[PDB]
Amino acid sequence: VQPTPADHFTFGLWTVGWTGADPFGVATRKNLDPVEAVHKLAELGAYGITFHDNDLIPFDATEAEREKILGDFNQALKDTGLKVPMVTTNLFSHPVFKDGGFTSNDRSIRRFALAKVLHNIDLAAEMGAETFVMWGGREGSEYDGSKDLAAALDRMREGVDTAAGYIKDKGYNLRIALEPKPNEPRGDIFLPTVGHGLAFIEQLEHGDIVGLNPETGHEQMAGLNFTHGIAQALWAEKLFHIDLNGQRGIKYDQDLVFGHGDLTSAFFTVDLLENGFPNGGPKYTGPRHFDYKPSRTDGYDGVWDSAKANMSMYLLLKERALAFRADPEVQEAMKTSGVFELGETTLNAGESAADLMNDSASFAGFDAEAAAERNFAFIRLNQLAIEHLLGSR
Amino acid sequence: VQPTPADHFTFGLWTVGWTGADPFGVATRKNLDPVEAVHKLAELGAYGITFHDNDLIPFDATEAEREKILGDFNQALKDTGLKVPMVTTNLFSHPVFKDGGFTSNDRSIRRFALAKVLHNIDLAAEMGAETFVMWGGREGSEYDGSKDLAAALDRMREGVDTAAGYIKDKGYNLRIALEPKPNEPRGDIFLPTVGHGLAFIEQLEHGDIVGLNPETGHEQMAGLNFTHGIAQALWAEKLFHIDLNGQRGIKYDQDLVFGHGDLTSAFFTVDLLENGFPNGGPKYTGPRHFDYKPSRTDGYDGVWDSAKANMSMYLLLKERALAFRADPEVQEAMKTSGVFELGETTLNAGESAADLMNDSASFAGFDAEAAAERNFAFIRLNQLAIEHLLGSR
Amino acid sequence: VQPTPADHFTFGLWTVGWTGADPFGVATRKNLDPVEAVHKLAELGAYGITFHDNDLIPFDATEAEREKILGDFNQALKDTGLKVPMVTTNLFSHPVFKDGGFTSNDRSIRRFALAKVLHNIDLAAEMGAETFVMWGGREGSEYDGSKDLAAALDRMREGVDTAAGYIKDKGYNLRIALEPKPNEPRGDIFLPTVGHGLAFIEQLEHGDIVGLNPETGHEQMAGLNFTHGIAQALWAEKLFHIDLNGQRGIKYDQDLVFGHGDLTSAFFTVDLLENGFPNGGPKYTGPRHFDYKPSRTDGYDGVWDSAKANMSMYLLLKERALAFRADPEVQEAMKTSGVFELGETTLNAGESAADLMNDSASFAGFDAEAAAERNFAFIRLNQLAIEHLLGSR
Amino acid sequence: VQPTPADHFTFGLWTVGWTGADPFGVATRKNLDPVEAVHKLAELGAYGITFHDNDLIPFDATEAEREKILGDFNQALKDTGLKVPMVTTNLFSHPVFKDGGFTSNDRSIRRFALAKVLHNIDLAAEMGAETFVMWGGREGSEYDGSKDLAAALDRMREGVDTAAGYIKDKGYNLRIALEPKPNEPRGDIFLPTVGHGLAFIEQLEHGDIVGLNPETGHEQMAGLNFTHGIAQALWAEKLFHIDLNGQRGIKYDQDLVFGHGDLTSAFFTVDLLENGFPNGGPKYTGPRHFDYKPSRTDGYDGVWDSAKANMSMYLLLKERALAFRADPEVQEAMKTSGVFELGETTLNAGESAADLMNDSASFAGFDAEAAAERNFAFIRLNQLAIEHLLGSR
Ligand SMILES: OC[C@@H](O)[C@H](O)[C@@H](O)CO
Ligand SMILES: OC[C@@H](O)[C@H](O)[C@@H](O)CO
Ligand SMILES: OC[C@@H](O)[C@H](O)[C@@H](O)CO
Ligand SMILES: OC[C@@H](O)[C@H](O)[C@@H](O)CO
Ligand SMILES: [Mn+2]
Ligand SMILES: [Mn+2]
Ligand SMILES: [Mn+2]
Ligand SMILES: [Mn+2]
Ligand SMILES: [Mn+2]
Ligand SMILES: [Mn+2]
Ligand SMILES: [Mn+2]
Ligand SMILES: [Mn+2]
Fold this sequence. Notes:
The structure is a homotetramer. Chain A is of the alpha/beta class. The first copy, chain A, is built from 15 helices and ten strands. The first copy, chain A, has a single domain (1-393), classed as TIM Barrel, CATH 3.20.20. Chain A has helices at residues 13-16, 34-44, 53-56, 63-80, 107-127, 149-170, 194-201, 216-220, 226-236, 263-275, 300-326, 328-336, 353-357, 368-371, 378-389, and strands spanning 9-12, 48-52, 86-88, 131-134, 140-141, 175-178, 188-189, 210-212, 243-244, 288-290. An eight-stranded parallel beta sheet of chain A has the order 8-6-4-3-2-1-10-9. Chains in contact: A-B, A-C, A-D, B-C, B-D, C-D. One manganese (II) ion binds next to loops of chain C. Chains A, B, C, D: Its cofactor is Mg(2+).
């Protein structure tokens, strides 16, 4: 292992800063000072830090306190070298956001959440963030008739397009990344998966600067294939940022260390981010951000162990994934399974639909029974990945 | 109850025709003749019938048999009055489609599946279908490295855009509807949810004639809110057809009768299709198609009971949903919860992002603590829907 | 439907008293005075109230304070007539319980937890409770190597047998009810389902006074059929208490109002509680307790509405379920499907194994293809039940 | 890693013999001659083979045919040396079993099923099997009113006690292993988890020779922790057999190769099977049986590869898990986290309940805030385990 700033490992203030209050109990750890967070992360090898507005500046803070806090915070960044690649807004903790921010049924709350966002774009630009994340955690319902489902999406579009037009208007070098979550805190959250988020962006006026921020655990909460889902985001050129963590099953959002959830899936996630596609295509070159929570059973030595562990796991997996693809038995196994064959277009250069239809060899005279004999050898190919992952090869 | 053709209840041939072979056992019912299917459905009050190419014409059938089968089939339609609103292709039963049709790793199979589709568009147009459904049941994997995820989506786009360009080329009055499914038969199926399907359509060259065919049970297999998901399809103006059935939980695709799964959700599904949105907007006016399977424990009297039951459930639920929205206590409950308030734009006519930011009343001088006191009364509003559903009001 | 004390609707103090703090935000409602909870519930028709030691008496409460609180609460009970059928212990909120109470890895903590339970048995006895509930919320792990799993069960056994032994010694008219939950707050909780709870009880020294307290939503968090789970518990005579609420799928513990989750399942649980088993058998006679949480979106008017909705839902389901079994059409359908034939022993009186295998009629010349022809008509029985549920019959 | 007969790898005939028929398509592979299965498995290092009555002997097999088949298969066994450790009955494939075998609603069917089992006990005994497995696949319902649930358990009990009684009477050296599955093929299956299986066994007349046969993927279909489930079964001394495979989430029964599902869980199951409990306790000593299905995409080369992958995966996990516990660093971490302190009884020798509640140190003056400071360091213990798993240590 041994991470270095070149690796682009970024951590949120709320991750290591998470004190342990869950639904059935109080905090088990003392508050973490943000200046202490910066110094500790930088010592460990992180490249940058992210935060929610209220992670740094209390909801209550007076103008004088905002500036006091920011001066110390900017000093620490200076002292250490950490960048601030992403900034986000808390539109979920305060009681006012109980029915959402942007899709709150109350119009005065929608205006209040949108202004909170607009002000936060100003700080984002001031900090040098390239990405502004939006996780609509309270946008949804417990009951199906609580909302006019079409109006909720119109109100979501108004907020996102107002914010986007504001970025464009000010010429900030910022992009919006939406973050999908199927449920929790709401019984049903709007734009629950990568797909729903991607689809929604296509209905926006300012869609060009809006992309996604998928999170491992979140897609796994709907039982989906995370690599499949980031693949589709990348393919659409909408994978703007990423949150890496662990989740074991469909249950509450666990936010374990990356690699402490579905290990085999984490491996293929790393192969996609590091290696990209077998036949070539797009690559994700942004930060490797960890949106996790250090288990409440553990003290501060567990907090810094867990931060370390996120980075180690990614570097261990990276290593095994480079070895796996480089392996000539793997490349031959890949060749056999038709991995490169899928890259070939289906139609010959210039062939029309009409041409393929009436090509006797592709249909009328095709031997479907003989084509069905093909041994795709997907099991053997899977077996080679696991052995590479197990450090066995 | 009592359905009539005006209700637009359509059934697939494979639904009532399902003989009971599941993964752990053989068929428990005798094959259903298609001409018997047409006569029986029409007697029950159905409006139309749908089918997969191989539901009617065996894979093997010679040209002479195709025409014999179609003549009898067209005669029965004539005899009875049933329309054929949707046609689809089987790209999953034959051993040749073991790695998919359109995204098969084998290029010769991709060509064979696309030609099978092209020929089937011709029959679709011949039959008077307005919708051509595409359920990519074998498009996916069990193992993450079996596929080049970007190439799979390029091969999916090539098939769908070739088929679409073919419709446009021939001037058929047909639209393509993709049908999402999270898993089964594959461990992970591409375009697993409504969202993923919607997003994918936006990357197509011929996206204008491509929409979705969501299925109750399928979105429920990822634990999603079906009404939420069809809401988003409708909002995007992509809800081209629908498959209604029942599913109890995240497990195998059960395909129970509509209403025999998640009842409360079926109720709100019916409220959305019949009533549309509380503040007005889009409406789904296509057929009410039932993609279900009559439980294998039951004989043919259970088959016709189940067909009846699909229609009854929808009409019972429709009744309760009309009463619920018409109810003045419900409309006042709705008013109280802010259902109509969400329809109001957030920004005043002409207000800019800049204007809202610096409006002291929306941010600086906003009383967030007072706005948080609002009783949204969502529980009471839910309670009124259940009582209407229970026939209690 | 108007509840009367005779209905036996019990409510925990923590239910209507739930303030709204969740993992992503703060309390939305002010604390509830216990005196007031008692009075309000008494006006609604509640029969009794239940509580956790710390819901009533603060963790750090001095003795003078404990006496006052108890004085106020016993005054309230005397004034209103509310009974206190169950008392439980909080072994999950204080940070000392972060790895469990009874199965904490730290021995001093295990000792404290058992002491804390023993004292609470005295209190339970002085309050007149018949049931003592144990919900081991912190008993489990996030990670598989955290626990010696055989040793966690010995530790669990030690604690519960010590508590049972003490009950017996003291002559208290108290039974212990264990309550399963699959996950949350821990990634995996010990004794996660009704099956695991019943199984563990059989390894206990004092299992005769140890039974279960299943909760609707907890069984649905593993995707099990709650009606089937309480039927096993009844069948083993181990259904000592029940916790009624609603859950809308496999996700975080929702604790919605009873019937605000899976509706048909709610209906069939009510049918089991009220009508018992179709061929007779044990019947559940304890409190009909609601362990739910008033959505945080709702103000105090919502709290009493939701309290009321629980009893309304239950009474509405009871009315329907009584009509359902009383229907001649329903009884006929039941007959046809073999619901009453299941109740007949398989063997004949004094028919042994050998007698049966040698009986020619039963095996050697049994016509399996003719037997397989039976139309069980389970679909039609199900349709009849739903029609009773919707009150269209 | 090369398996030897000493490893005790057993395979069902239906596993490598699985032809590829699923719910959406036909068989992709030709039938496997049983003689050949035996020989191939013997060359790979299998120790034994298992089967279902009908995998070997057709349902309609005449007596002359049954004798031949048995002759061929016993020849094969004699030639290769393969043992037959478990035999099971098919009570799910024929349409007669559509509502179950033992808990079918039709009494004549229940009789046939019990007869069919009794005969198969004779066969099992003649083959030299130590275990008799019962997987009640058709025992359950799709709908809640289909069964008298107390009566379904009496019927289940009757059947299993009759089979156990008969074993005892005949003097066979056979134990019965019940195998839970939550759903599929039925919507809900009776005795769905290890907990339910263990619980039911305690209500049996002859429960002493009745234990469990848990399957990896089945527990993961309810989202439970398989390692925790087999630990309860071990702890109760009821782990008679095990079925190893992989499952990638809550969905249809995948039956992938062992380790091709949840990897860390596989690792921790292997650690439990090989290393036992950290503080000692019972140990599992039966066959390491694989109940998997070779993906249908793969030809016969894939079948033997996958067979082989199962034993490779298991041996690789064993190597790692032995290294893991042998590591001093790992043992130190274990010490720190209290893995060995869990094993110490909570009470002191001859310390009663009263002694403890009155012990001041344990409760009255226990410093709960100081105890809560303990850093359990479960995260770091977990990181060490994963690092052993990936062989980076
Ligand atoms: O579930 C919590 C979400 O993952 C947030 O942490 C977003 O990433 C930032 O608001
Ligand atoms: O899971 C099966 C699918 O639902 C299909 O029936 C499509 O609706 C038509 O191919
Ligand atoms: O998940 C929370 C639990 O259900 C508690 O309310 C128990 O019922 C009593 O501690
Ligand atoms: O779901 C199928 C089952 O797992 C069977 O293979 C049993 O193990 C034996 O009938
Ligand atoms: Mn998360
Ligand atoms: Mn996140
Ligand atoms: Mn389906
Ligand atoms: Mn469908
Ligand atoms: Mn709960
Ligand atoms: Mn509870
Ligand atoms: Mn299985
Ligand atoms: Mn099995």
